[PDB]
């Protein structure tokens, strides 16, 4: 069941996080310059977080849509955690979660309750990153409806259990 991350599960997530939009809400099949409109600050900031650890920069950003970037990047993507792509995960993990909820106790619960594996537990924090709560969760038991619903949206992908 275990397989590494696809760039359409790690970087299509990130460009939906900057627009504060949903997964189906972006058209997914058009270029970055046409996505944001004419804001021209987030457009240079999308290439800011698309160029940190990711073999940093492609041959040209604004010619490919959100798939046709990633089909080029699969031979360059080693299945990394993310330096500051994956640091937005820790931002959710400290600002919106109760006291005593760093990534040690979370990654235990993703395996010992549902069963995902470390190759698939990267791609379930990112579907937690697109739907963040508006406030910090006031109890440890609030991770039983927030974090469990991320694996149910992950069940709309490969669909294991």
Numbering used by the authors: 139 to 299
Which sentences from the paper describe this structure?
Unlike the dissociated systems of individual enzymes that make up type II FAS systems in plants and bacteria, Type I FAS systems in fungi and animals are large complexes that integrate the key enzymatic activities required for fatty acid biosynthesis. In particular, yeast type I FASs are 2.6 MDa hetero-dodecameric complexes with an α6β6 configuration, which form a cage-like structure comprising two dome-shaped reaction chambers on either side of a central platform. Along with structural support regions, enzymatic domains form the walls of the reaction chambers, with most active sites facing the chamber interior. The mobile acyl-carrier protein (ACP) domain tethers the growing fatty acid chain and carries it between active sites, so each can act on this in turn.
ACP density was weak (only becoming fully apparent when inspecting the map at a threshold of approx. 1 σ) and poorly resolved, as was also the case for previous EM density maps of S. cerevisiae FAS (e.g., EMD-10420, EMD-0178). In an attempt to improve the quality of the cryoEM density corresponding to the ACP domain, we performed focussed 3D classification within the reaction chamber of the complex. While classification with a regularisation parameter (‘T’ number) of 20 did not reveal any meaningful classes, using a higher value of 40 (i.e., putting a higher relative weighting on the experimental data than on the prior/reference) yielded a class containing relatively well resolved ACP density. Particles from this class were taken forward for asymmetric reconstruction, yielding a complete FAS map of 3.1-Å resolution. In the latter map, the additional density is consistent with the ACP domain of the α subunit of FAS, given the fit-to-density of an ACP domain homology model. Ultimately, the new density was of sufficient quality to build an atomic model of the ACP domain. Interestingly, ACP domain residue S178 (which tethers the growing fatty acid chain) is located ~ 18 Å away from the KS active site, which is in agreement with the length of the phosphopantetheine arm (18 Å). Focussed classification led to an improvement in the strength and quality of the ACP density that was sufficient to allow atomic modelling, probably as result of grouping together only subparticles with ACP domains in the same relative position (adjacent to the KS domain, as has been observed in several other yeast FAS structures) at the time of vitrification. Use of an expanded mask for focussed classification revealed classes with putative ACP density in other positions within the complex interior. These classes contained relatively few subparticles, suggesting that the vast majority of ACP domains were adjacent to the KS domain, with the remainder either missing or occupying other positions.
